[PDB]
């Protein structure tokens, strides 16, 4: 028995997608609802829009953009060409918004249902789709990310804790550089890190949720995962006790590192995927490593939460669209009998309302 369930949703090559376009710069998956792929067929640049609820009928539309990112919930698409940003409602055949930046945008992403984050060489901006809003600067980039490839940007639910991640080569390894910014304190902290996520977690005995920051890093000394509360606990709350645990890489994976993290608040588990195809599952509360295995041959370069299973969905370089989630019938007996951790088993059974801890 395994504590996780793997599912293949699609092979993009079966829909006519050229594998040269299956990569970080040309394929975006901002949520589990859509995949957008920029392709050039003949003279014309196009975007192929895969609706994940109707995936055998992808729609191809001409574009003149260097990047396209679909809204997480709606057929509203953001496109850019150098400094020109445009937002379309596709069903309404409508240009919702147009904005001309004064810097090129190196990385952008939807950070919520109605806000796009824009990263330039020098700063990070948020742009709300509500009313007549324009981009607002959130913070200046820290010099520790200068020259990095920007690979992610995430926030907590209230958009008060902001996290920018870049990577570069130093001493012959991929080194991650993060910038954590507090909107309320107006302070940045540079952190060595590869992949991260925020999560809301209500501790037993607390009236209010804690906001947790979780990050994984392969440092010079080895792999580590941290789970730490950000900010002052809400009044009345006990503080969340911070956790730090090892992240294992086997001897043959000397050059592997973390590339993606998603946290299930249904099960309070952390999914971590590495560059070279390994999946790890950690308990959010303790950081206990529940499971590790190799699940892709190919590098997985983009992920999103998988809403239906409260798991993680991802696309690999072959064009396989794959999800991983907690196997709700197996996770508790796995932790009891294979990990031999009846304490964790019992806790998770009761915490997340899972069957199996009736015998320990």
């Amino acid at each position: 028995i395994l504590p996780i369930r793997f599912q293949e949703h699609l092979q993009l090559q079966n829909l006519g997608i050229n594998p040269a376009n299956i990569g970080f710069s040309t394929l975006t998956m901002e949520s589990d609802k859509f995949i957008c792929i920029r392709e050039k067929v003949g003279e014309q640049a196009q975007v192929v829009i895969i609706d994940m609820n109707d995936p055998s009928n992808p729609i191809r539309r001409p574009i003149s953009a260097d990047s396209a990112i679909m809204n997480p919930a709606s057929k509203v698409i953001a496109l850019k060409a150098g400094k020109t940003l445009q937002i379309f409602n596709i069903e309404m055949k409508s240009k919702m918004k147009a904005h001309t930046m004064t810097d090129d945008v190196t990385f952008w992403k939807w950070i919520s249902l109605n806000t796009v984050a824009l990263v330039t060489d020098n700063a990070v901006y948020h742009w709300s789709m509500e009313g007549e809003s324009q981009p607002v600067k959130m913070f200046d980039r820290h010099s520790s990310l200068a020259g990095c490839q920007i690979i992610n940007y995430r926030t907590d639910a209230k958009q008060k804790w902001l996290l920018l991640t870049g990577i570069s080569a130093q001493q012959n390894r991929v080194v991650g550089a993060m910038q954590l910014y507090s909107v309320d304190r107006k302070v940045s902290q540079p952190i060595e890190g590869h992949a991260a996520s925020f999560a809301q977690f209500k501790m037993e005995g607390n009236a209010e949720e804690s906001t947790l920051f979780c990050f994984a890093v392969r440092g010079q000394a080895g792999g580590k995962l941290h789970i730490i509360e950000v900010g002052t606990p809400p009044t009345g709350n006990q503080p969340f006790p911070k956790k730090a645990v090892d992240v294992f890489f086997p001897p043959e994976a000397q050059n592997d590192f973390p590339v993606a993290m998603q946290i299930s608040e249904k099960h309070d588990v952390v999914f971590l995927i590495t560059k070279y195809g390994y999946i790890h599952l950690y308990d959010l509360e303790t950081g206990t490593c529940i499971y590790m295995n190799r699940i892709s041959g190919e590098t997985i370069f983009v992920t999103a939460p998988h809403e239906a299973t409260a798991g993680i969905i991802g696309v690999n370089r072959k064009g396989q669209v794959l999800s991983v989630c907690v196997e709700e019938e197996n996770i508790i007996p796995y932790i009891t009998n294979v990990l031999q951790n009846p304490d964790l088993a019992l806790r998770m059974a009761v915490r997340n309302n899972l069957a199996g801890a009736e015998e320990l």
């Binding site: 304190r185 920051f213 950000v230």
Partner: peptide
Amino acid sequence: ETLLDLDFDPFK
């Protein structure tokens, strides 16, 4: 000002 202490804190 730092936001987070990432090392073991015996005083909390």
